[PDB]
Every structure is written in structure tokens, then in C-alpha cells.
Design an enzyme around this catalytic site. Structure first.
Site, PDB file in Angstrom:
ATOM      1  CG  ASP A   1     -10.072   1.062   5.304  1.00  0.00           C
ATOM      2  OD1 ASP A   1     -10.235   1.414   6.491  1.00  0.00           O
ATOM      3  OD2 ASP A   1      -9.896   1.870   4.371  1.00  0.00           O
TER       4      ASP A   1
ATOM      5  CG  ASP B   1      -1.949   1.118   1.179  1.00  0.00           C
ATOM      6  OD1 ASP B   1      -1.993   1.864   0.177  1.00  0.00           O
ATOM      7  OD2 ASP B   1      -2.710   1.257   2.160  1.00  0.00           O
TER       8      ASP B   1
ATOM      9  CB  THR C   1      -5.459   2.571  -2.660  1.00  0.00           C
ATOM     10  OG1 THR C   1      -4.333   2.718  -1.786  1.00  0.00           O
ATOM     11  CG2 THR C   1      -6.628   1.999  -1.876  1.00  0.00           C
ATOM     12  CB  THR C   2      -0.563   1.313  -5.614  1.00  0.00           C
ATOM     13  OG1 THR C   2      -0.877  -0.017  -6.046  1.00  0.00           O
ATOM     14  CG2 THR C   2      -0.050   1.268  -4.184  1.00  0.00           C
TER      15      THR C   2
END
Lengths: 43, 517, 506, 513
Positions: D379, D52, D85-86
Site C-alpha cells: 500500500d 508489519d 498497522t501493528t
């Protein structure tokens, strides 16, 4: 029919090579201290 | 102590990792930079190690080893030298296992002795075949192996001329090959497929005067100009020591020119008395002598090297002339036709001497589209007389391409279990490292190294044919007999033996003392 | 692939981007400012540009050698040679890295594309040969294609009649030394004159007449500087200066005897290679013979081809060798320095073209235009096939490359199509200097050839698609084959580099 | 002075290469098959190894402003997806690279390129909405699809091979929260040692504290009280007071009054009827013995973050101002006992009064996995909690980006003109996102992606890329599906951030202070 290849970056070990060498120096330290025939160290 | 062992091995592993991609016809080229900035692009490992910054003496020993190996066959130099480097990794484990270095070196020597009889088992005999099959085998033998670079696409044009060049220099009595008789030229321009072959000697230098006619017509003789070689310098005789000429009158000072004016006349008349036309020498010409040289229709070239006159003397079949007093009709040469051609646009010309009868001087015209190709062409153009020299010396012929290294490895591996002792982990370690040549072929062709050994083991073992090998050309068969991949027996035998003899030294290295250069 | 080839791709493209503005007839010229001698040169051709520019990338220095090949063979429009190879390096950054294909396979894709490119150039060639009436008249429009790529194009129609009559006087001479190009400062390009003869920048003597008719010209390699040089290691041994003063004076009469041998020829003009002393110069005035000196090497060689004579060293026989004759040798002063104008040559063995310009940079650069244009005229006489340029030839080859890609298929089609896409970027770069729309002009040209129209092409003057035959755009097959075959093999070597070895500087 | 300014010539090239250079590190982190990176910190000589980029790109100093906005928007991704999310920075780097090649070829004004991405983003939202599947109508399949949603989002860390053991953790935990989106309710504790699969989900609370002296380690049927009152430091005052006395007699009376202060304070605590007491601060020795005399448990040193998690998990309430014993509530647990997890023994709670929260026990091999499992579980249930709110889902795993390419290609035909070049460039750059994903596993990104491209145009939506076998497999068979809310924010924010970076014609570097 050849195809294949799938190389791209030609130095995948370059990051993982010197780190094993740095780990081998630590690994070679316990080899002399291993077992009842081993040796001691001073720090 | 033992810490220096890895120092010499890792130094060779770095060199072997660079040339690993240089193996096989699908390999890639290295750029060689000189200290002055000259660029050299070639796949030859001997040339790469020739110009380079080298620290360890092992890299310098590889150059000494390549000198004897390049004089045997002359192709696949990368697929030879690197084979000895793979034995250092297997010997490194034996050092960890506690095997003495001499026991490692003597183990590699005894395992290489059995490879002689196994390689000569199925080798074909070309001596029984006629000269037609001898030319057909040699023609398609190099096409796969020869070109590693550039012209290896169009190399079919070079292979056809390379076979016709040896037939002229090699007589039908026995077989004899001399590679110093055929020279190697080169040009920058045009295309690579325009190379031609003429029978005779071809001089790259042109005439020294602008008005000299380019082409010569036939005459009452052989239709040649009866070329002669004059070693004596062209000039009036000059005493090598000092000379003091006393002038007591105007006539004595004026007759000094009359001498050299008569010497220029007698020098040219002796050419006309013997009937010669084109006469070349090593030195230059005078200003006044060029007029009478042109008016008598006597083309000439100046500043001709001594190496070029050797092939010229063979084409003319005459004698070297030390002094002008040795000029004679019987000493004149015999040639057929001599033509002169301008090459790129304004580039200079060259004298192409043709021989009607079969002679020992054959000059192959070379053309290329880049200067870097020409420097690369030095290695690429002529490997032929070195390759065929092994076929004519030993009629035994095998098939290479990585097939024989696996077959002879399994033969020694079976003999390793018979001796047992310390020769088990020794001989097997030697045979296991011999598969790097076909394994590297699997790197460029993209084949599984595990599946590479399994494919050849399921064939070359059960079936006596050892020709099964790695196919880098992308065809539907792995058989080298159908794909026409041919290596000479005695030539490849030396490549295997000289590679094993290198380990008789490096493996025993313990202490190194380097004195100041 | 990553650290192996890094500056070999982007570095070579950055070099081609500097000369990108120099490609095409609407392009502009680059200024070359040398860090030493404080000199400068303005040249469009990349032969001089790539030679004088410092190149840190070894692959960029290789582009200089392939440029010298097209410099001697063609010499005009050589910029597109290195630019076409730069586009092949850009497509290799993807297929080798992204698509993960071995470089030799990408090279093999270009090897099969090079064989298919030669088939498209031969079949599309137009044969202009046989009768030289319509052939020579077509050479006017054929030359205008490659004649001016510069900003000097205003001289096109003017030099079109001069370049056409230049080969007409040669009558089949393929040697570029038989033509004489004169560079004169001042004036305009439209002031260039073409006459039958030769114009020398030297002058006559003091008392030599300005007009001589039916003069016989003879050259020689001798040295009239003074006395006699004789052999090496000489000296004068005399009792006193009485004999020494005679030896120096007698040789002046001995040279006069050689001049007396010149008078036996009956020549009205004499030409010497080296300088001439005043005494043998005045002896030429008594005989009424012009004198020319101070010719290093080519001074006597250029005049020998025009006059058709022969160098006579001995002066012994007024029978054999050669005697040249010119109708009017009169000295005609052009510009500042007086010039020697020859007319009425004995034969058409040679010819001379006189050029005039205001800027000195225009004289040196436009010399390469006529020098390369005459080479094209000699190739159109030898090679009978010609093609059509102006961006059309690249799209015609793209039709054959895309056709071969359907037969090969496989994963090599990515390398074959990339070769076609590289051929699509050349007219984009060609039309980039004009400043018009690339997507509009290329799509109209590319789709028209697929519809069966091979006569279309890119027109950068009007910014539309026009017929190349009407505009007079014609390229010979020798020019087109030499550029494509060399540029295809130029990048073939650059893609074989798997490592970079940097030697220690001296 | 010393202000280095770059015009549109230098700033256009420097801004595009800035995001590509640093973006190459997050390209290999995509998907479960992605790799990790290492960072060497000059301070404390620490490191962080994770896929991440929120904790990677934040600690990497960079002088290129192009990636500065990419780090700030990672917090939005940290508030929505949080794992993998990269791709926001990778897709943005591809949009900058394709636009760099688009301006070098088409040579259109950069504002026109942005107008193409504006029309291309509209077609991407239509493909995701029409392909959205809502399974919340069936509660039986809804709880089963949460596992399929989990298997996609729970593969990040090197430990993803244990997902089969970790799938039951997030499956039952999201059912215990019943609408709790806050991580303060979720109890996450780290334990060093033990096998990687030893992590289990226990119902209760796990406390890392212990009992001071005489407190029995096992207490049954206890009333848990949480108090912010001060014990250890006692008399500390902070008045405007000063001390003046005539003799040492009244000096000891102040200490006697200190005992009466605590004796009257424990008397109000004794009226609570509690067997367990918890303080925010430390407990002094005198009330510590009073807790053991009355049979009351003692827990001390509960920080601001831990004092809330006690009442949030057990359903209790933090109680202050002891003067009102019956006005507050008391926590209750069935079994309160001390267990041993790893080397450090922990206090275990069982039978909580409120099941609103749960405790996840995390045991791992190395300390590197402690913060690594924290990022994977940063998350975890919150992603499942957002699926409880927004129940529309769509098949993910690289196929959804290929489905949107069909909608962009269809919209590009209705647009046409010269703006379709930027619209098609967005489709070409979007298809390169799964191509880089195939490059991370070392499989074929050429033939497989080419077949997946034609498969979407043939009308097969369920077609996708198999990560394990490296072939074409349906996502419904593998169970790879993502919610509509998460993917909509990833594609939209990546295009909105790329519009700003293409607008930079100048880079001004001020002289450092």
C-alpha cells in the site's frame, strides 16, 4: 540530577551476540582463503 | 593453539559482565544459593565467588587474589578484581596484532611501576595532624565507600561508633590496630539504627537457671562481681580410666555421695572464700549443685566457647584457671558493671560487661530487622580496623572514587610515547583499560563514558589536582576533596599492584590439562 | 531488569494473594495440609503459613524471615507486612522497566519515603500514660483492636475482661512466662474461667485427700525413681546375696531419711521432677503430703512462678530458701481428665487463664491471640504513644508522602508517589475481604483526612466511614512503627537483586 | 474425551496473557523508528524480517485464541493502511492489560467495562472530526501535501533513510494514475543488484522477457498485440477424434494441414498490420520464424497476472478470435528496445498510448529488501488514492492519540459515575501508545510524554513528538499528517476487537485428530 538510566531489557546483545559468533565462524573461513597466500577448501 | 586464548577470556568476560553492575555504592546485589537452600545476599565479589559453581581455574584464582585484597582495606571489592579482567580484552587485541604474551605481561608490570610515584605526589600526611583530625578524617572516609548495601542509608550511626571503637583498643603511643580483639555480634529484630556501643565483652549466651537474677548490684569492690574464668569442668572428680570401688558395708556405699556432696560444697566455698560472684566454665552443671549455686548468689553460665573467653580474660585482666586449686583473690578479674537484657520479645538474654577504665575489649551491639541482613551484616558491619590499619601503617592518604585511575593512566600514556618501540601500543593499552572503574560508575549514575574521560582530562591534566572524578551521589561538584571520598594510599596501592600481578600468569596460559577429580 | 527480575515480582504477589483472604478482622483462615504425617493446621498468621509452604522463589523465602521478626515483636496482623512489600514490587515493574529508572534510584525514593513515614507516625501518635485508672479501662477497648482477627470474634467481649484482669494480677510483669494459658477440649469460648492460682492437668496419689487447706508447696529437681544412681562406672562386690539384699533395702531407708528431712520442713505438698517409686510414694501418704511427678523441664518451672518458691535439692536447712503456701489446693475435675486447682497464692507473682473450646484447632490458634495481646499491653505500659488503625493510618501517611513529593519533585516523585499509591492499595486489600466497594470507602476516607479530620476510618462491619475512637480501634506506636519500618526495609533488599544464581541441588 | 476446559478463573488470566506475550514482538515495530523481528521456519528454512505484523503474526503458530482475531483483522488494515498497522494489536493488548488491572482493582463486572469503552469511542471520533483539515480546495497545496502524507506512510522498511530519494517516486506516480486504486495497474518489478538509491520512476513498461532468435532488439513505431491463442503446442485438439489412415501418404498430409493451419493463422495475423505480437503461452518454432519473416516481434510465456498488466499499462486490449481484425484495438508505444537492468537484461517500452498506469523500477542491495520493499509498496499509491477520495486529514505521529485523550477526559467528566473508570482506562491506555513509540527509539518516554500531555490540555493541537531529535516539534513543520479515513478505522477496530476478548469466560480445547 542523575536520572538517565533508559535500559529496560538488559540483554540487547543476546540476540545479536551468538549471530556474530555464527558469522565469525563464516568470517574466519574466508580469512584463510584471502589473498594469494590463502588456502583452499573442500566441500 | 591460539584458540584457547578466547576460551579463557570469554570465561572471565562472563564473570565480569555479572559483577559489572555490582561496582560502586549505587550497585545491586546478587543472591547466593547454597546446595542446602541457604540464601546469601551480598555485594562482595569474594563471597560471590566463594560459593558458586566454577569451571575454569581463573575464577578460582580470583578467590586467592581476593584473600590478600580483603585483608588490606576491605571495601569496594568489586571495584578492584574486575579491573584485571578488562586487561584481557586489550591483550586479546595484542594477540591479534602479534605481540608475544610475555611482552604483554612485562608491559603491564613496567607500566604499573610508574603509578607508585604518581599516586604519592599529592597524598596528604595525617601524621602531622593531631588525633582530633585523625578521627574526623576516618569518620567521613568510610561513609561514602563503606556501605554498599542496606544500612548504607543509616550507616551514619555505624560510622560514629566505628571511630570510637578503635580509640579504646589503640594506644596514643604511635598507632597500633588489632582487629582480632574486637568481636562482631548480631541480632534479628528491632531496627538497624538501634545499635549501641559498650566498653567491655558481651556474651550472647544467658544464665542456665531460670531463677538467676538478671542484674547485679554494686558491692565493696570495683562494683563488679569479680568475674573469673574456670577451665576445669564443674563436676566431682572422675578418673579418666576405669575405677572399681569395693563396697563391703552400707556406710562405704553411702559415703560415696557424701564425697560429691562435700566436693560441691568445697567448690562453692572456694568461690566465697575468694570473694568471687559470677563464675563461668566450659562445661555444664549438675542437678543438686544448682541449688547451692543459687542460694549463695553466684550467677553462672555453662557451655561457654573458648573464643568468647579470650575477650573475657582481657576485660577481667586475670589468668586462666586450669584447676579448682588455683582459685585465689589475686587471680580474680576486675569489671565495672554487668547487666542482662532480654531482646526481641521472648528471645534469650545476653551478658553485657562494662569496663569503666579504657580497655582493649570493645563489643559493638548489633541489631537488624532481617535474617538476610544479618548474613549480609557479616561483611558490612566491620571493615573499620582493616581500613584504619592502612592509615596507621602509612600516613600517606589519597582520594579514590575513580579519580586516580584516570590521572595515572594519562601519566603512563605520556611516558608510553617516549619509549616508542613495542611499548607504545602496550602501555597505552594498559592505561586505556584502567578507566573502567570510573566508566562503570557512569553506568549506575547514568553518565556518558565519552564525556567521563573528557571531563577529567580537561581538569586533572591542566590543573594539578587529581581529585576530579565521577559523582554518583548526584551533587553539584565532581571534586572528591569536597565530597570527602578517601582511600588509603598503601591500601589502594596494594589493590593496584595485586591486580597487575594477576596478569603475570593468565596471559601466559596456553595448554590446560585437567585430571579427573 | 527483564530476565534479571521476573518471578521476583509476580511470584511474590501470587504468594500475597493466597494470604490476601487472611488479612483483616473480616478475613478467613487458610487450611495448611502437610504432604507428610497427614496432619493439618489452621492458622491466620503468615508465620506458620509461609514457613510450611514450598517456595521456589528465593525472594519469597526472604519474606519468611521478615515475617518471623513481626511474629515475635507483634505476631498479629503480620499478613499486611508481606502484602505491603508485594505492592512495592508491582510498582517497581513499571518505574524500572516502563519509566526506565535505575533500581537504586527507585530504592532511594523509598529511602526518603521511609524517613518521611517515620515523621508522620510520631506526630500523629496519641499519648495515653500517667494515671492507670482511665488507662486500664481504655486497655479494654485498645486490646479489642488486635485481639481477634479470626472467626472466633464472638469471644471478644468475654476475653476482654479476662485479658484486662490478667495484667492486673501481674502488676507490671513484662515476662510472658508469668502467665499460664490452659487449653481444654470441649465446651464454649464463653466458658473460659479466670481464677487466682494455677490449674495443673495432673492428679494426686491414691490415698491423698481431695481438699487440703493452708498447704505448703515445695518443688525440687531430684530424682526419686529408685535406689541411688551415684556416679558413673559403679558396681556391687559382695560375698553373697545376704549383703546384696541389704544394700538394696537400706537405700530405701536412706531415701526415707531424705524424706524425713522433708518432714522437717512441715510442707503439706511435695513435687518431684522425675518419676517416684511406690515405696517413697507411700511414705508421703504416711506424712500426709501430696506428690506430683512427671515434669520434664517446664513442669516445675511454671509452678515455681505461681507459688513463688525455690527449687531445693539438698533439703538440708528448714530456714533459708523459700516456702510457698496456697490457701486451697483442692483437686477439681474439669472436663474428662482430673485437674489440680490451686487457689490463694502467697503473692501475685503469676497468673493463670483457663480456655475451653470444642475444636482443637481453636485452642492452638487462639493461644497466639492472648499471647500477642499481653505483649501489646506490656508495650502500651512501656511506650506511652498510640495511634489509630482501621485503614486511617495509611491515608495519613499518604498525606505526608505526597507532601514530600512536592519538595523533591524531579523524576524521583514517580517513586515517591508510587510509595503513596502502594499505601493506598493496603486498605483496598484490607477492605477486599469484606466485599464492599473500594472506590466508595477509600475516596471518603482519603478526602476526609485532607480536609483535616484524622478521626475517621474504614468500618467493615457497617460498610461506611465511622470514628475509630467510638468503635474502639486503637493501635500502639510500638506496633505501628515495627510494621511500617520493617516492611519498608523488607522490599528494599528485594529491589537490589540484579541477577539470579541457582545452585546445583544436592 | 480429552477435552480440557477452563472456567472463568483460568480462562480470564490465560486469555489476557496470550495477547501480551505475542504482542511484545509487535510493540517494537511501531513508527519509522521501530525495529524488526526474525522468524525461523521449519519448512524450506526461510525467514521474513519486517515491521508489519501481517506477514509476521500469520506465520507464528499460537495456541491462544485471543490473538487469532487480531490476525484476521490485519487483512482489513492490509486493505486500508498496510504500513505500521501493528498498533491495532498493541493498543488492543494495552486495553486487555488495563482491563486486567481494572478488574483486579475496581472489581466491576466485565460488561460494565465494555460499556465504558463504548462511550469512550464516541469521544474519540469527535476529536478526529473537529481536527480534520481538508486541503483539497487548493490544488497547489494538495499536490504538495501529498508529499507530507507520503513521508509519514512511506517510512516502514530499513530503507526509510532513502525516503528522500523515494519520495519523488510516489509523488509523480500518484499523479499518473489519476484515480486508479488497483495494484494490477501499478507495475512493480524487482531487480537484484545496484545501489539502494538507484530506484527511479520511468514512463513506460519494463518486461523481463527477451526475443527468441531473429527479432531485432530495437523496434520503433510498433503495434502491440496481445493474444490468448495457442501456438507452441499446435495440433493438441481435445476432440472426440481418433486417427485412422490407410498409408503414410495421408499421414504427412495431416502435418501439411498443420502448416496450412498456421499459414492461414499467420495470414489473419498479417492482416492486423502489427510489428509486435504477444502470446499468453509459448510460441512454436514455425510461427516464430513467420514473425521474423513479416517483421513482427514475438513475446511468449505471459502468465495470467502479466497478460493483463500489458494492456492495463499500455491501454491496449487482449485480442482473441482473429477473424475480426478491425473490431479490436492495437497498443502502440514510441520506443520499444531492450535495455539492461542489473544482470538480467529487460525489454523497455516508451511512449505508451495511455498514461493511466506507470512502472516503478526497484533496484536493491539484497534479496531481503525485495520482499521488504514489496511490503512498503504494497500500500503506497493506494494509500494516496484513498486520500484522493477522502481528503480530510489530521496531524499524526503520536499527537493525534494525545488529542483524543483530551476529548475522552472531557467526556469522562460529563459521564462520571462508576463507568468513568473504564472511560479513563481507555484514555490511559491510549496515551501509552506514543509512550511505546518513544521506547522504540531509545529516547525519553517519561518527561517528553508528560510535557506532551500538558501541552494538549493547554490548547496546542500542533504539538507533537520529534522522532529524529527526540524533542517537542510541530507536525506541520515536520510534515507528519495522516488522513481521517485511515486513523478512524485503526482506533475503532482496535476497540471493537477488544470488546470481544474481554467476554471470554471459558476456553475449550478439543482433542486433536
Amino acid at each position: 540530577p542523575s536520572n538517565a538510566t533508559f535500559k529496560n531489557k538488559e540483554k540487547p546483545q543476546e540476540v545479536r551476540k551468538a549471530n556474530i559468533i555464527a558469522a565469525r565462524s563464516v568470517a574466519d573461513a574466508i580469512r584463510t582463503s584471502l589473498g594469494p597466500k590463502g588456502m583452499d577448501k573442500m566441500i | 593453539g591460539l584458540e584457547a586464548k578466547k576460551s579463557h577470556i570469554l570465561a572471565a568476560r562472563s564473570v565480569a559482565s555479572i559483577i559489572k553492575t555490582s561496582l560502586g555504592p549505587r550497585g545491586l546485589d546478587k543472591i547466593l544459593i547454597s546446595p542446602d537452600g541457604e540464601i546469601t545476599i551480598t555485594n562482595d565479589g569474594a563471597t560471590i565467588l566463594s560459593q558458586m559453581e566454577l569451571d575454569n581455574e581463573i575464577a578460582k584464582l580470583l578467590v586467592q587474589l581476593s584473600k590478600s585484597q580483603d585483608d588490606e582495606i576491605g571495601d569496594g571489592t568489586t571495584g578492584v578484581v574486575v579491573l584485571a579482567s578488562a586487561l584481557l580484552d586489550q591483550a586479546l587485541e595484542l594477540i591479534q596484532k602479534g605481540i608475544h604474551p610475555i611482552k604483554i605481561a612485562n608491559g603491564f608490570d613496567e607500566a604499573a611501576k610508574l603509578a607508585i610515584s604518581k599516586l604519592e605526589e599529592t597524598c596528604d600526611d595525617i601524621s602531622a595532624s593531631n588525633d582530633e583530625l585523625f578521627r574526623d578524617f576516618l569518620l567521613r572516609a568510610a561513609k561514602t565507600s563503606l556501605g554498599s548495601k542496606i544500612v548504607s542509608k543509616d550507616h551514619d550511626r555505624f560510622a560514629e561508633m566505628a571511630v570510637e571503637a578503635v580509640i579504646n583498643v589503640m594506644d596514643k603511643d604511635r598507632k597500633d590496630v588489632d582487629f582480632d580483639l574486637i568481636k562482631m555480634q548480631g541480632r534479628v529484630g528491632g531496627s538497624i539504627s538501634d545499635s549501641k556501643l559498650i566498653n567491655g565483652v558481651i556474651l550472647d549466651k544467658d544464665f542456665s537457671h531460670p531463677q538467676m537474677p538478671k542484674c547485679v548490684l554494686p558491692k565493696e569492690g570495683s562494683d563488679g562481681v569479680k568475674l573469673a574464668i574456670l577451665t576445669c569442668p564443674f563436676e566431682p572428680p572422675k578418673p579418666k580410666t576405669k575405677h572399681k570401688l569395693d563396697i563391703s558395708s552400707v556406710e562405704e556405699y553411702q559415703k560415696l555421695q557424701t564425697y560429691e556432696q562435700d566436693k560441691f560444697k568445697e567448690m562453692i566455698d572456694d568461690v566465697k572464700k575468694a570473694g568471687a560472684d559470677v563464675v563461668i566454665c566450659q562445661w555444664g552443671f549438675d542437678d543438686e549443685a544448682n541449688h547451692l549455686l543459687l542460694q549463695n548468689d553466684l550467677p553462672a553460665v555453662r557451655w561457654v566457647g573458648g573464643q568468647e573467653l579470650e575477650h573475657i580474660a582481657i576485660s577481667t585482666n586475670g589468668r586462666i584457671v586450669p584447676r579448682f586449686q588455683d582459685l585465689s583473690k589475686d587471680k580474680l578479674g576486675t569489671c565495672s558493671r554487668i547487666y542482662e537484657q532480654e531482646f526481641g520479645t521472648t528471645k534469650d538474654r545476653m551478658l553485657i560487661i562494662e569496663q569503666s577504665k579504657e580497655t582493649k575489649t570493645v563489643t559493638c551491639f548489633v541489631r537488624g530487622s532481617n535474617k538476610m541482613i544479618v548474613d549480609e551484616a557479616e561483611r558490612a558491619l566491620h571493615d573499620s580496623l582493616c581500613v584504619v590499619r592502612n592509615l596507621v601503617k602509612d600516613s600517606r592518604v589519597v582520594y579514590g572514587g575513580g579519580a586516580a585511575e584516570v590521572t595515572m593512566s594519562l601519566a603512563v600514556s605520556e611516558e608510553a610515547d617516549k619509549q616508542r618501540g613495542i611499548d607504545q601500543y602496550a602501555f597505552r593499552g594498559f592505561a586505556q583499560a584502567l578507566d573502567t572503574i570510573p566508566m562503570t560508575l557512569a553506568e549506575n549514575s547514568g553518565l556518558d563514558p565519552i564525556g567521563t574521560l573528557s571531563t577529567l582530562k580537561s581538569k586533572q591534566l591542566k590543573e594539578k589536582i587529581s581529585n576530579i572524578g565521577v559523582d554518583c551521589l548526584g551533587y553539584g561538584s565532581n571534586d572528591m576533596k569536597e565530597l570527602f571520598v578517601v582511600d588509603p594510599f598503601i591500601g589502594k596501592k596494594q589493590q593496584i599492584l595485586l591486580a597487575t600481578q594477576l596478569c603475570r600468569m593468565i596471559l601466559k596460559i596456553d595448554n590446560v590439562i585437567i585430571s579427573g577429580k | 531488569a527483564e530476565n534479571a527480575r521476573l518471578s521476583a515480582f509476580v511470584g511474590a504477589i501470587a504468594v500475597g494473594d493466597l494470604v490476601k483472604s487472611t488479612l483483616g478482622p473480616k478475613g478467613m483462615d487458610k487450611l495448611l495440609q502437610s504432604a507428610s504425617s497427614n496432619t493439618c493446621m489452621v492458622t491466620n498468621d503468615g508465620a506458620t503459613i509461609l514457613k510450611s509452604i514450598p517456595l521456589d522463589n528465593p525472594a519469597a523465602k526472604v519474606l519468611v524471615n521478615i515475617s518471623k521478626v513481626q511474629d515475635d515483636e507483634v505476631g498479629d496482623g503480620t499478613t499486611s507486612v508481606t502484602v505491603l512489600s508485594a505492592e512495592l514490587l508491582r510498582e517497581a515493574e513499571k518505574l524500572i522497566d516502563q519509566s526506565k529508572i535505575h533500581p537504586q534510584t527507585i530504592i532511594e525514593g523509598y529511602r526518603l519515603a521511609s524517613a518521611a513515614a517515620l515523621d508522620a507516625l510520631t506526630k500523629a501518635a496519641v499519648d495515653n500514660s500517667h494515671d492507670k485508672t482511665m488507662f486500664r479501662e481504655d486497655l479494654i477497648h485498645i486490646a479489642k483492636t488486635t485481639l481477634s482477627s479470626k472467626i472466633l470474634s464472638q469471644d471478644k467481649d468475654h476475653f476482654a475482661e479476662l485479658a484486662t484482669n490478667a495484667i492486673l494480677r501481674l502488676k507490671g510483669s513484662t515476662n510472658l512466662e508469668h502467665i499460664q494459658i490452659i487449653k481444654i477440649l470441649g465446651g464454649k469460648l464463653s466458658d473460659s474461667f479466670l481464677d487466682e492460682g494455677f490449674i495443673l492437668a495432673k492428679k494426686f496419689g491414691n490415698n491423698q485427700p481431695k481438699r487440703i487447706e493452708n498447704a505448703k508447696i515445695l518443688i525440687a529437681n531430684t530424682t526419686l525413681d529408685t535406689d541411688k544412681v551415684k556416679i558413673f562406672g559403679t558396681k556391687f562386690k559382695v560375698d553373697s546375696t545376704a549383703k546384696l539384699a541389704q544394700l538394696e533395702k537400706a537405700e530405701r531407708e536412706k531415701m526415707k531419711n531424705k524424706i524425713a528431712k522433708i518432714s522437717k520442713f512441715g510442707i503439706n505438698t511435695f513435687i518431684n521432677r522425675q518419676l517416684i517409686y511406690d515405696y517413697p510414694e507411700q511414705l508421703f501418704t504416711d506424712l500426709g503430703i501430696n506428690s506430683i511427678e512427671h515434669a520434664d523441664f517446664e513442669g516445675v518451672e511454671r509452678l515455681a512462678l505461681v507459688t513463688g518458691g525455690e527449687v531445693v535439692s539438698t533439703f538440708d536447712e528448714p530456714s533459708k530458701c523459700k516456702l510457698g503456701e496456697c490457701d486451697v489446693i483442692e483437686e477439681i475435675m474439669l472436663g474428662e481428665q482430673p485437674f489440680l486447682k490451686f487457689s490463694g497464692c502467697k503473692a501475685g507473682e503469676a497468673c493463670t487463664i483457663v480456655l475451653r473450646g470444642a475444636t482443637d484447632q481453636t485452642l492452638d490458634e487462639a493461644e497466639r491471640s492472648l499471647h500477642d495481646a499481653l505483649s501489646v499491653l506490656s508495650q502500651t505500659t512501656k511506650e506511652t504513644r498510640t495511634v489509630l488503625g482501621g485503614g486511617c493510618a495509611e491515608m495519613v501517611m499518604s498525606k505526608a508522602v505526597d507532601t514530600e513529593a512536592q519538595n523533591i519533585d524531579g523524576k524521583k516523585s514517580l517513586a515517591v508517589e508510587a510509595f503513596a499509591r502502594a499505601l493506598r492499595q493496603l486498605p483496598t486489600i484490607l477492605a477486599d475481604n469484606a466485599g464492599f466497594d473500594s472506590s466508595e470507602l477509600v475516596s471518603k476516607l482519603r478526602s476526609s483526612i485532607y480536609n483535616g479530620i484524622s478521626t475517621s476510618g474504614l468500618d467493615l462491619n457497617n460498610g461506611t466511614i465511622a470514628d475509630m475512637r467510638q468503635l474502639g480501634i486503637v493501635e500502639s506506636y510500638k506496633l505501628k512503627r515495627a510494621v511500617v519500618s520493617s516492611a519498608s526495609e523488607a522490599a528494599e533488599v528485594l529491589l537490589r537483586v540484579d541477577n539470579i544464581i541457582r545452585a546445583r541441588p544436592r
